[PDB]
Design a protein around this ligand. Structure first.
Ligand code: CA
Ligand code: CA
Ligand code: CA
Ligand code: CA
Lengths: 107, 153, 85, 597, 597, 105, 150, 84
């Protein structure tokens, strides 16, 4: 309920005339232990699990004096994730232009 | 860097709503009565069991061993945004064919193999295999969420 | 009675009441640690709650806040607040 | 049993996802490229070295920097002009005092066969005397608010409005603004840099535009945000193309980007910091971009913020020299760090790095043509080349250029050596500095000095080089080629070479190019056409061949179609098994073969 | 029989000439001053050291320069902002990127008790978004052409128009623009520099305005040309007064000037060059200006064009330290030459020159008060003080400050000594560094080092000094005074001292000032009032007396009204005949006497 | 050009024609004159008979040189004459372009 | 350096006309019939002998031992420029008195001495003296030139 | 017809390997007229004026380095004499 319509962050207000409209989907990759991509983040080549913390964010933002080893969104966003194993390679292309969060969990 | 300037997922209300859904049996399920198989795409209606909002799944096999999944509202109040100018062309399609059937699942074959997609109706799910080796599953953890456009205020 | 003060460089020996009397009597400036009278003297900021610091004697009561504890401005019209945090 | 779960969550739009099933990683590259396109072929000069900072003060300063490179024997292709070159951050203008004659400045750079890049940002100063603002306001081409007014935020020129680059009429206006009649003072050797195109809004939420601003078609900014920058990049590149009548290839650097941005030019990692850990992270950041199609990637050499110590600057020049986009840049309050301002020992290490980059230009150009035609990344993680070596799956202090060169730059102060992982069960590796052969797979400890750049050539590859380093790439584009043949365990090798005029679309509109295949097996090096449709008039010839891992022949004979059989002199090093063939003298457009008897 | 003929030829106007019959040169000074007025009393800070260049980069650079002076223990009162501080040379504005918070920058400088000067030139950019241009055009306040359109020429911002400063309505508009509400970002510690006010017109005849342009009342530009700059100076100075409510004294530097410009502030010799002969010529140029009433004169320390060698810069600091207007300035393309950027030996000599200037501030201030009240020049040719010594009539490598100090700066590279002419029969001169006494008349060969500034005090004079050098003059203006008594052969001396609050007109509107007379005769030093109308609340006291040319007394006794008779301790050097009286401790506002028994 | 006059590429329409004024002054006993700034020249003014007169016209001279009577940025039309016996001053109150000739006897 | 940007006296037409007049007998002459001694000044008409142009000389003794000489046209077509805002005040005047007179000259005394001004009618000339010491002469070389408005 | 000897004292090559557009001498002395050696020099005679040596890498680079223009003889750039 809170923030589903009109929402404020710091001193800025989002009138959000359309209300909650988000979309989401999960994908399971059997045999995959290494995933890569979804730039841009000042983070490792091999993407980390997000279970204990923030998901990776894709939202083109100007971050003054950005720091290293964190999933904060930087200037660019390419919603493409690659999965590599000894046996195969796979890719996922999430063609969406809005703010996007990506969660990664191991098994 | 000043990290209070930039939202966390909790401070992004749509991220908080989405991330609050926990792994379990999905409330979405496919109405196999609605299935239509054309040369270019398979369409099938989805329904949220609690809210009864109706979605449309457009499933496509593509040339060069690719699959495209598109999901929209069945009759939205207003059209939703579809990203232009990024794709360089209309992706060439590969024909889908029914190769396995029961009350709660449908198996489709892309062109002449080896790739096949099994659609389980309840709970809604998609699995992709080369012959019989499972490559990846969709909505297997039941985390799918599609906030339909509600009435303005 | 009482004993006189001697400059640390050995320059001279002056009575105690010529220490911090706002006139420079020692070549090394050691007789005016609390004033701006000597050109080569130093003033010590104790700066409780931060790192202590020495400043030039010429910056004592110059109207500018040099110590974080403000003790260098005690008779200049500038009131310095403690900023050692 | 091991499994990885991925979940995407987006604020609006539909669910639209492509599953790219491989099975190989190069299949995934092809699958994605068929969807979103391939890397635009960069003009040759843009693969050279770029000298930049915020800011070069005036025309005299620009000309002094140009002369400094020549006076200190360092190559450089482009000098960049940051925001202080314009009239109070009114883009498409020139400061009337410090840049009063831009055409004269550009002509002088052209006489040195060098280019210039000027920054053009998307935000437009709100100013009724600024013709750009008046036109965009009068034609309704600005991003809007819900009340129907033009959105106004704050950026470099103070109060500014934001063109709606999602509007096709706006992109057409922007493209036409780059014509030589509209962009007064510009010339064919002036290129463009798009910064702040996220868009950056200093007083906006998260330093960007409000979610409920309104764009073309009534869509909210929340719907389109992540492609706003791509549209800026696209419209700028299109303007550089049409200003020439559709003949010249563009160069545009962009900060913001999206899927498909590879079609419009280069990107870089933004405002980094002059620290060793920022140097290290440039590899995983550009590698993560290479994997998703953005091959033209780099980071600010020396760091944008703060002042690097001389040793860090040297190590950053060595790192940048082997990365796709090679530009030094610096913040307004940093000290000047043009490479000749350092002590002689640091100058020489930097000059050596610049010479290596320029010598490898034919190799860089060919890799980018293969990226342009196939969608294969230029800079590559080791696991892309060795998908079955699990010990490479996380390596990020190492990368490969194509399949031929493995790079492990020094990225630690006062290091005495590096640990280099040389993969491949059936592979051999040659240290390009010492020509020592190394067996794989192994972790080799290599001692280093300040001048060391650990680079290894893979056995089975042929690498073309311009060994005559000149002051800019334009000076070198007709020079002879030296071929470096690294023999495989089977005594074989192969390589390609792409050549054209270096800056036009003639390779595509007129098939005016060369694509050569060089192949070695047995004791014969053969040049044949890898694409017969391509022909090119060029004086480029083969002046030298260097073969790593070969024995001493009794005689060397050259055969070329149209010519009698010729004898070549040679030199052989028995210690390193290196054979140097002197002056083959054959045209690069000709079929030929060299036989070791 | 010897005779000189003078002929004046003017383009228009009437014949209007004043003959000033003397008979003494001080009578001529008084005669001219009664016609055109006297030198405006400068605020004390403007007699300190000014640090300037084209250009300081941004607020951070200005604050860094400010901190550099304190970190290297060098005094400085003002930091100057040249044309790059504004928005594309639109005056009364600030660059939105490099100077986004001028009030905060001015506040930080106020916390260091320092000032800032910003340049405001008379030419106004033709720009419909520039509010200054729109107002001046809408109110018809521009210089016009014969067809009735506003004149348009070319200068720093490109195409620009020129306000008609001969129009009183224009000068009133200009003055009101300097109010803190109109000149946004300005503060009480911001002052003004008027440049290019000849007026300079880059595309005009002889780089100035057309002769047939039209001014207020229908007069042609040929009729009024030489007072256009004076009107700019006047209207700017009045604006700095009016913005304060009529309380604060202005400081305005102007490049162009005319008869009467002394009433409005300072002038300098424009764009000189970093060469030894330009250093030499600063003396005759400011001396020729001093003789015609313009006492607040100087030249760019170090030269405007080109880069001075370190030794030339040291010698120019020593020269400038003893000239009225004391500012270092430099062209856009010169290297940075803030005085701490040089080697330690050069730094120390420059610091020594800065300390001498600041210690002499009470002396300078009194000389300018005498100029303000009497019309007597501050800097003087030797023949003004010795009108019967014919060998002084052409001297220009030497000058005097008032009647007390003779200055012969070193103005030759690698000089080992100078020849100093010490004039006056029965006159004595004291080397202020060594206290050696020299009888006149004679030409003395004085050996010099890098640190030497040949300065001599005349016998019969008393010079007041602040011996406690601080970071700026504001810091020093309540400090105690040291008196330097140079005894004549008759054992006498005299001197004056003016004191006030240092920056307001209270000395004139409220008689809030002190003018003291110090006189020595017999064996008694007496302080009395030279003007009884002046009273002032001040903590300034006499902390030391230095007497040159005295024997050793048996006792020293101080008498001041209101206090018991006191004994003073003292020190005497028999070699140099120098007597130092310790800590008289008497208020400078009190009558007192010191007797040497 | 007594009326319409052009110099280099600039034209002076000069609608009022020739209107110049001039006057000479003799200073017996005077051998040293000073003043009339601004010029990059010596303190003691030189005779102009063999060359150019001193010019008073506020002008912006790029990279001005030394020891010449060219007009610089400011103009104060005041000349001082000094001898062993007396001092005199001449103040020529005119705001137009002014040339000054100095001759000895 | 190429200083062709700035006029020499030869390239300034009014300087060339004026400087071409060389020392000689002046054609200007004072009409002593026109003399008027006013409260502040002495006025007298001057005439150019060849062109018959009529000028007005306003001669003033001032306090602090100063003399002011002003010359304008008698009947100008348009007003000539008089420099404003430079003088801080109207200079206080001293009374002038005729103390000598002959056919070709008038001697004037400032207040009560010792300064005197001798006006020579033909050719026009002015001499300034302290008692009997000649201090300065005006138009002694006959270089006066006043181009009237055509 | 005698062969050429490098000035560094290293090797001896036939006369026809002088200015043959390939670097054969370690000191670069066999290619004074070409751009073939990385450490060679090209002499601008600059007849009637100050002579000058330039880097071999600036021979026929398309840029006018000598005032007499002789460093550009086969590059497409035509340099005019500016030694005045
Ligand atoms: Ca003491
Ligand atoms: Ca202090
Ligand atoms: Ca050769
Ligand atoms: Ca060349």
């Amino acid at each position: 309920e809170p923030g589903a319509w009109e929402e404020t962050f710091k001193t800025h207000s989002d009138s959000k005339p359309y209300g909650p409209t988000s979309v989401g989907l999960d994908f399971s990759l059997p045999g995959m232990e290494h995933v890569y991509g979804i730039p841009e983040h000042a983070d490792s080549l091999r993407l980390k699990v997000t279970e204990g913390g923030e998901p990776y964010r894709l939202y083109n933002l100007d971050v003054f004096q950005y720091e290293l080893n964190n999933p904060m969104a930087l200037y660019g966003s390419v919603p493409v994730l690659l999965a590599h194993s000894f046996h195969r390679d796979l890719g996922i292309f999430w063609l969406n232009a809005a703010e996007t969060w990506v969660d990664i969990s191991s098994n | 860097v000043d990290r209070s300037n930039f939202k966390t997922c909790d401070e992004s209300s749509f991220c908080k709503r989405q991330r609050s859904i926990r792994p379990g049996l999905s409330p979405y399920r496919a109405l196999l009565d609605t299935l239509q198989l054309g040369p270019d795409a398979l369409t099938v209606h989805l329904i949220h069991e609690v809210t009864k909002v109706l979605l449309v799944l457009e499933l496509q096999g593509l040339q060069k061993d690719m699959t495209r999944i598109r999901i929209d509202e069945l009759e939205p109040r207003r059209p939703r945004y579809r990203v232009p100018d990024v794709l360089v062309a209309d992706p060439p399609t590969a024909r889908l064919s029914v190769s396995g059937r029961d009350d709660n699942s449908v198996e489709l074959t892309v062109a002449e193999g080896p790739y096949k997609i099994i659609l389980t109706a309840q709970p809604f799910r998609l699995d992709l295999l080369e012959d019989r080796s499972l490559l990846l599953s969709v909505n297997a953890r039941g985390l799918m969420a599609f906030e339909h456009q509600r009435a303005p205020r | 009675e009482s004993k006189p003060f001697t400059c640390l460089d050995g320059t001279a020996t002056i009575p105690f009441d010529q220490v911090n009397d706002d006139y420079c009597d020692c070549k090394d400036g050691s007789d005016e640690p609390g004033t701006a009278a000597c050109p080569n003297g130093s003033f010590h900021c104790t700066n409780t709650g931060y790192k202590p610091l020495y400043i030039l004697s010429s910056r004592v009561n110059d109207g500018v806040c040099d110590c974080c504890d403000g003790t260098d401005e005690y008779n200049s019209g500038t009131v310095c607040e403690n900023t050692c945090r | 049993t091991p499994q990885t779960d991925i979940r995407w969550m987006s604020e609006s739009g539909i669910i639209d996802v492509f599953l790219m099933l491989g099975p190989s990683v190069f299949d995934v590259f092809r699958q994605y490229a068929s969807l979103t396109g391939t890397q635009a072929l960069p003009p040759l000069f843009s693969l050279g070295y770029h000298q930049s900072r915020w800011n070069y003060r005036d025309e005299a300063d620009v000309l002094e920097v140009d002369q400094g490179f020549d006076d200190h024997n360092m190559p450089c292709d482009v000098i960049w002009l940051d925001i202080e070159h314009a009239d109070g951050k009114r883009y498409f203008t020139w400061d009337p005092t410090r840049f009063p004659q831009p055409l004269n400045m550009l002509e002088h750079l052209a006489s040195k066969r060098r280019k210039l890049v000027a920054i053009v940002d998307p935000h437009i100063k709100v100013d009724s005397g600024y013709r750009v603002h008046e036109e965009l306001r009068n034609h309704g081409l600005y991003v809007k608010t819900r009340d129907g007014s033009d959105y106004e935020g704050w950026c470099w020129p103070g109060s500014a409005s934001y063109p709606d680059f999602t509007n096709p009429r706006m992109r057409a206006w922007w493209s036409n603004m780059f014509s030589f009649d509209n962009y007064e003072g510009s010339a064919p050797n002036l290129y463009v840099w798009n910064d702040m195109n996220e868009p950056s809004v200093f007083n906006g939420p998260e330093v960007t535009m409000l979610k409920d601003a309104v764009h073309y078609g009534g869509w909210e900014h929340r719907d389109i945000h992540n492609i706003y920058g791509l549209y800026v990049h696209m419209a700028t590149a299109d303007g550089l193309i049409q200003r020439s009548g559709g003949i010249e290839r563009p160069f545009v650097l962009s900060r913001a980007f999206f899927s498909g941005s590879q079609r419009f030019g280069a990107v870089w990692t933004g405002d980094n910091t002059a620290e060793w850990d920022h140097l290290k992270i440039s590899i995983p950041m550009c590698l993560s971009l290479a994997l998703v199609g953005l091959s033209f990637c780099g980071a600010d050499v020396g760091g944008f913020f703060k002042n690097p110590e001389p040793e860090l600057l040297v190590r950053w020049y060595q790192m940048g020299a082997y990365q796709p986009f090679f530009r030094a840049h610096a913040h307004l309050d940093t000290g000047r760090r043009e490479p000749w301002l350092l002590a002689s020992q640091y100058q020489d290490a930097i000059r050596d790095a610049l010479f290596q980059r320029y010598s490898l230009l034919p190799f860089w150009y060919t890799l980018f043509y293969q990226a342009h035609k196939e969608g294969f990344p230029v800079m590559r993680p080791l696991w892309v080349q060795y998908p079955e070596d699990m010990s490479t799956f996380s390596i990020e202090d190492q990368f490969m250029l194509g399949d031929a060169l493995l790079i492990h730059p020094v990225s630690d102060a006062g290091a005495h050596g590096v640990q280099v992982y040389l993969p491949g069960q059936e592979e051999v590796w040659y240290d390009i500095q010492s020509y020592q052969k190394h067996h794989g797979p192994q972790t080799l400890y290599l001692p280093v000095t300040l001048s060391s750049i650990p680079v290894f050539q893979r056995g089975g590859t042929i690498v073309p080089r311009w060994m005559r380093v000149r002051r800019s790439s334009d000076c070198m584009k007709d020079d002879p080629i030296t071929l470096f043949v690294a023999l495989s365990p089977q005594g074989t090798a192969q390589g390609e070479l792409f050549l054209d005029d270096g800056h036009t679309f003639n390779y595509q509109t007129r098939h005016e190019f060369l694509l050569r295949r060089f192949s070695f097996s047995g004791s014969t090096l053969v040049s044949s056409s890898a694409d017969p449709k391509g022909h090119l008039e060029t004086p480029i010839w083969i002046e030298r061949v260097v073969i790593m891992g070969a024995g001493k022949p009794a005689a060397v004979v050259l055969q070329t179609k149209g010519s009698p059989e010729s004898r070549l002199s040679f030199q052989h090093d028995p210690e390193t098994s290196v054979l140097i063939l002197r002056k083959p003298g054959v045209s690069v457009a000709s079929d030929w073969s060299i036989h070791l008897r």
